[PDB]
Amino acid sequence: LEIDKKNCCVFRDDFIAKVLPPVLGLEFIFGLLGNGLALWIFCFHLKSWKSSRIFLFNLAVADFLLIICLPFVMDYYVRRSDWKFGDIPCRLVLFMFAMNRQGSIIFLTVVAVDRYFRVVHPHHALNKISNWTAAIISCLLWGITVGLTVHLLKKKLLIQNGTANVCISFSICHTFRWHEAMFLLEFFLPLGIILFCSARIIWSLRQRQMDRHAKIKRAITFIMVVAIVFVICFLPSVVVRIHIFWLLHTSGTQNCEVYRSVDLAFFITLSFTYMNSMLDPVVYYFSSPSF
Amino acid sequence: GCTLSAEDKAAVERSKMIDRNLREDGEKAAREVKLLLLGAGESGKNTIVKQMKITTGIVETHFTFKDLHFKMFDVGAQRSERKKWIHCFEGVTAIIFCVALSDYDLVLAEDEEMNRMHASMKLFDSICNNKWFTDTSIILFLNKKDLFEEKIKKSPLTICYPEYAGSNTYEEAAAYIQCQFEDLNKRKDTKEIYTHFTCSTDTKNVQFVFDAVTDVIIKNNLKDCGLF
Amino acid sequence: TASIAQARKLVEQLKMEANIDRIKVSKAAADLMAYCEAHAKEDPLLTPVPASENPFR
Amino acid sequence: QSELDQLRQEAEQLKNQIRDARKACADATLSQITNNIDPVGRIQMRTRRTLRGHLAKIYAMHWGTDSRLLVSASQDGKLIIWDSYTTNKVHAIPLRSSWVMTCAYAPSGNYVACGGLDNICSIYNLKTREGNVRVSRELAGHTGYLSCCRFLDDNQIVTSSGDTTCALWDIETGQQTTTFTGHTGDVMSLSLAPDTRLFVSGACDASAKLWDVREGMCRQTFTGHESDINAICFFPNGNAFATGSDDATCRLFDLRADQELMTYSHDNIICGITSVSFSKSGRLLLAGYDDFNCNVWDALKADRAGVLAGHDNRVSCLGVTDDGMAVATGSWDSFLKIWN
Ligand SMILES: C[C@@]1(c2ccccc2)OC(C(=O)O)=CC1=O
């Protein structure tokens, strides 16, 4: 039918229930286990708290929340439709996914910037920064994330397509809504920052020798590891979004039969953004000699 | 606060001002680099300090280079037991050790048979393998190479090291001495030893100290963040 | 030359530290026990003190 | 060298005679005499106060005679005076040399003293015309690091140093009135008698000596330990003193019997003792250890009557107030805790 005017078709596919739910459940279980164990270690098993641990704590919290709010979408796919829960726990879940993902990206970028300043500028005041200022920075970052995500809360996110109710935010429409702009923006700029910081770290550490200790050699690979993990986890979604925008521009919003395959591929690739939440403890939390 | 009297309020504000001063002093003192200077009587510590700076007890030298404030502590005057006060220096950025490599044939004034170089090696072995300096970097300075070049032509190194098997060229002898000193390091995993060959006119030792300190601080930062 | 002087000093020390009045161990132990039991009620750590007269509440 | 040999033989004969007399005077032992004594209940104290503000390791502390104020010394070059009742800081004296190793409080509450690797004993005036604190004197006669200092009056002080000597000073003059040169190793601690007519010291030669302040001579020499002596305390009665060493043992000596009386050791303990102190009645012997906690001993039965465990690093100093109300402990983790 229609979704707040702006004639644009939405699609429902039965292919999702065939493939996604098992893989998504496995990802949820792995992420929940990793996040819970990491939180258990950090909250009580450790006493020395620094700026790096503070900045990692918020990333762990965001990953834990994103893993927690996932069975709600498990229900959305196993039942295939109707969003039985209601209306408020649709805006709520579409808020708590976007906010969690944006927080994860922001805290990954902050960790990378902290490492870059620790390696390239060893004698800087930012390296010796009090826990109080770290808490202020964390609160400000969380506030920015919530302020950018709250746009979806003061609206209506229901469609009621015939006998099926869909709880969706990515609606294929000829519009330049803030959601699509944010989805495009929160990838390239953090990608550039991470690549620049990683390249500077590698170059400055390599020209300065320091290869005999071999723990420097152990740690010089994890930077590129996390860079490529971020790249592979967040490239396909933005690629598919760009292709969808190009198709929408070159074919309009009519003839709602070509969008089927690209929408299916988009929903396939949107599950990649949940893959990083289970690898994050592996390559960021248990990958350090500290514990 | 609400129930406190005037005298209690005065005491509380005095305590708060004292706390503010203590915190600012600690923050100011946490940005400096602390170095412990060691050696022997004629190792050449004073010669190094001559270009570094540009009642018995402990004498402290403060110098600035590239916007870093350094602080060297010379403890050569303390002739008491070393084990009773060596734990006060646990937590220094690095240890600077001075060795006169031109004294391979000279002998100690106190005891004739014992060589000076062997005594220096024993002192280095004691310091390097100390339990309070498990992961503290050591900067090794070999001082009198100008006299070493002249004395190695007319004398063989086999006097100090009877197991030496090589030519009496200056480069080979200096390399052999460097490997003899660096072989005493029994950790090789927690600490790094930096060796430099200097003279009375090298005038570039402060840059070497700065580079070693920068490497140590980078390693400390990486250990703190989680890597390394 | 001074070695004999230091040896004489040590001999002097041992000479006028070896001539003192030494009591039996039992008497000293009894005196210690008597002093400990005489001030037992005055020790605020041997016996718990009521919170009324405890300045460190 | 025949004269030297006969002198050595005479010294050996004198030592044998002294040992034989000591053995003869030992009719019984304290432990079997104290058999019919009710064991003290399990002592359990709690951390009533925690004083924070030091940013480096704490090496020494000393209680005031009013049982309310105390001074502590830290390697960040600070000398803080605390109010134990309200935790408030009264003074914060900066030091010229940050390598401080000891501190003391005047019995009248007017002066404090400190020293360390600089070989100087600096004396500060607490009550002045203004509200600040300024240096009043600097005693500079020692050739090794200064390890302990105690006040006799407002005009006398006794110091010990790493040059194997102890000295008595005059604050207004500034000269060593007397020198004590018996020891052959670094002196690490000293303790004055309540009447301030005698004092004992313990050195690195595993022996302790008793000195007369007025004369300047050693009276008795006590041995029995196996390693360094790190702390010494003097019995409240005035006829005994306790010694803590690096061999994980504490011992009690009697001045009048002139021999060791009783030893305090346990099989699990392998770390050295850093500080010892007595309770007001002398029944409890509190000792600080290297294994991060303090132990309370029964001075008559050698039974562990309690454990004070609240520190994350080595306990370097402890002291009991004059009225026996509380005991304070300092540690290398830069915190002071008051127990009761
Ligand atoms: C597919 C989707 C969804 C689907 C059903 C219920 C809630 C959320 O997952 C999010 C997301 O991860 O950003 C956006 C969505 O629209």
Numbering used by the authors:
A (entry chain R): 11 to 301
B (entry chain A): 2 to 55, 181 to 354
C (entry chain C): 6 to 62
D (entry chain B): 1 to 340
Paper text:
Additionally, to deepen our comprehension of the molecular mechanisms by which agonists modulate and activate the respective HCAs, we have determined the structures of MK6892-bound HCA2, acifran-bound HCA2, and acifran-bound HCA3, each in complex with the heterotrimeric Gi protein at resolutions of 2.80, 2.73, and 3.01 Å, respectively. As severe flushing would be caused in clinical trials by the β-arrestin signaling pathway of HCA2, synthetic agonists, such as MK6892, acipimox, and N2L, have been developed and MK6892 is also identified as a selective agonist of HCA2,25−27 while acifran demonstrates comparable affinity toward both HCA2 and HCA3. Despite the high sequence homology between HCA2 and HCA3, 2- and 3-hydroxylated-medium-chain fatty acids, particularly 3-hydroxyocanoate acid, as well as D-amino acids, represent specific agonists for HCA3. HCA2 and HCA3 differ by merely 16 amino acids, yet they recognize distinct ligands. Meanwhile, the acifran-HCA3-Gi complex yielded an rmsd value of 0.8 Å relative to the 3,5-DHBA-HCA1 complex. Meanwhile, the conformational rearrangement during the activation of HCA3 is also consistent with that of HCA2, involving the rotation of R1113.36, R2516.55, and F180ECL2, suggesting the conservation of the activation mechanism across the HCA family. In HCA2 and HCA3, R2185.68 interacts with D337 and D341 on the α5 helix of the Gαi protein, while R222ICL3 in HCA3 additionally formed a salt bridge with E318 in the Gαi protein. Previous research provide insights into several residues (L/V832.60, N/Y862.63, W/S91ECL1, M/V1033.28, L/F1073.32, and S/I17845.51) as key residues during the different specific ligand binding in HCA2/3.34,42,43 However, our chimeric HCA2/HCA3 constructs highlight N862.63 and W91ECL1 as key residues for HCA2 specificity (MK6892), and the first three transmembrane domains along with I17845.51 as critical for HCA3 specificity (3-HO).
